[PDB]
Symmetry: C3
Subunit: 252 residues, 3 copies
């Protein structure tokens, strides 16, 4: 009279984590979401979120850096328990994984090369056949480039630094990427780069991704988000990482 329900509880990935004593977290490099610093340790907003979640669960944390384009297959094949990697909740991804409630929000922005894109002042100036746009492979930045600049030539990169180097070198007109990356890079490299428009042109809820059939793990993650949101801690961390450069000299 209770077997099915008890078996569902036992098979939760939350129970797998508790038995192992370690939360295994899949993520990828996006500055300042997650990145290796000069001491060789991972830091960033997503790292702070994952480290606190592990601590509040009473377990150790282990990070499993993964190629972003293969991060969902890695979750599905059990390379880790959870994606904490600044993943936008999306209905195509949700076919394969389940999402928590949002713990952050992001929006898409654009940074441009001063010589190639001189005089460009509007989104539509980049939606032309002769314009080359760079974005990160497998991300919502690529999807936004296709949606808002469909006539542009889109060039995808599996590495964030390789994409910005193309822009610095004058090989593409713009990089499309989540704020605050475009604004930060325009301020970092004013000799080569500029920010044509302030603000953002998408609004994207960010959630944890976990494997399906696990309502108990979802309950735990959503309850955890609600508590640290009400505490003001997510706002504090969002401001530190995305609205200051106080962490800048931790990096190589």
């Amino acid at each position: 009279g209770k077997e099915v329900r008890e078996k569902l509880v036992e098979e939760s990935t939350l129970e797998t984590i508790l038995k192992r004593g370690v939360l295994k977290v899949g993520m990828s490099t996006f500055v300042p979401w997650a990145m290796k610093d000069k001491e060789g340790q991972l830091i960033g907003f997503e790292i702070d979120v994952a480290k606190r979640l592990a601590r509040d669960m009473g377990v150790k944390v282990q990070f499993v850096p993964t190629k972003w384009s293969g991060i969902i297959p890695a979750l599905l094949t059990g390379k880790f328990d959870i994606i904490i990697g600044g993943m936008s909740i999306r209905p195509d991804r949700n076919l394969k994984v389940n999402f928590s409630i949002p713990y952050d929000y992001s929006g898409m922005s654009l940074v441009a090369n001063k010589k190639l894109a001189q005089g460009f002042s509007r989104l539509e100036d980049f939606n032309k056949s002769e314009v080359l746009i760079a974005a990160r492979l497998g991300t919502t930045a690529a999807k936004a480039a296709e949606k808002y600049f469909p006539r542009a030539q889109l060039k995808l990169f599996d590495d964030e630094a390789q994409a910005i180097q193309e822009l610095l070198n004058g090989r593409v007109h713009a990089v499309v990427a989540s704020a605050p990356l475009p604004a930060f890079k325009a301020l970092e490299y004013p000799e080569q780069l500029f920010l044509p428009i302030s603000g953002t042109f998408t609004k994207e809820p960010i959630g944890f991704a976990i494997r399906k059939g696990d309502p108990d793990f979802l309950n735990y993650l959503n309850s955890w988000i609600r508590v640290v949101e009400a505490e003001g801690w997510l706002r504090e961390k969002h401001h530190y990482w995305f609205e200051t450069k106080n962490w800048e000299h931790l990096l190589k």
Copy 2:
């Protein structure tokens, strides 16, 4: 040692939809939530919601128009996968079906007959035993009439146009219905009708209804709502259908 969990995933109605290639949606006629255009094809706020959801799942959409009084039994016996019908989340209904998070909010309003309700300037003027009120059978409008005008005689109709026609004919004092229907009809027929009070006297979250034991389908629907809400799409659609009459030329 994970059969129960793997079987729950396989038995989700989300997987049933994906393998069929078609989302089957139950709904009923309420202008402008869902109604036939002059070609005989369905249009409205709820139709647009269902069409986007199906498209974002990668499937076709098939509408199953249903008598509202039997729409939950139809869901339970498998006539369709989901109710996208402007349904208020309610605890009695929740005994039989599960509800998504809200994708819309509505509120109750009243439109009155000028001759029978001459002088009725307040809501309490309609809470009298000599007053007759019409409402749609099986809706929260019928419940609202029972709660806020318990002394009045309630006349129920399974057809929206039949109810407003009784009001137009001077056979009832008022129709209780979700905004914007009362305001729209008072502006459409000022010779017969008037709106004694602006604004609404209920506030009702609107949710999808699906069959129980399906946490995976619930996760998908709620994550979808969060994405299209943040995009501003639900707001745009709510404004077009419920705050303008720009769609009237599609009807007749």
Copy 3:
């Protein structure tokens, strides 16, 4: 057939257990004005009102199972009742064993101090000192808060609230830490001995129902119910009545 596991999960929900019994069994503990016995001998308060409307909207009777707070989660786990509706803060350590609804209320921590021992105190830091003795209820988030915000002070955990106040009045502790509005009530009650050194609250804690795990249908029902009564304004009206007025005072005496 082909839906066996799913149909069994539906049938094994505690929601169905409640509907078949015809009665909702609610675990709670006595905290004024969350839940308390009035002078007619009946339970009243914010949590009682929430539980009574939930039961009525479910179509069942309600039965309250008063339980000692430190043992309330073990009592839920062993089936002494169906649900905790007892002002319980959603917390990650508790969530290891039970599941939580979305929030139906929020609380924040406060503090009530002895006038003689804590004369001149006016900030949180004044109480964070080795000589300061602080009391908090065992097993509550007041104990966690005292540990976090007053780590240097000597912490006296208790489970007899009346005895803790007796010690605060005779000056055997400097302050009592507890969820607002209770410290303010104790201060506004005994203005000669006690006072309220800090205005407002220094935590923000979402409050949720707690239920046994593996029950996504019961969670859906509880969360949908909260959404409806929150939209109606009813929860905020009940929060105001119990926690921001004393209109209920003379039901007690």
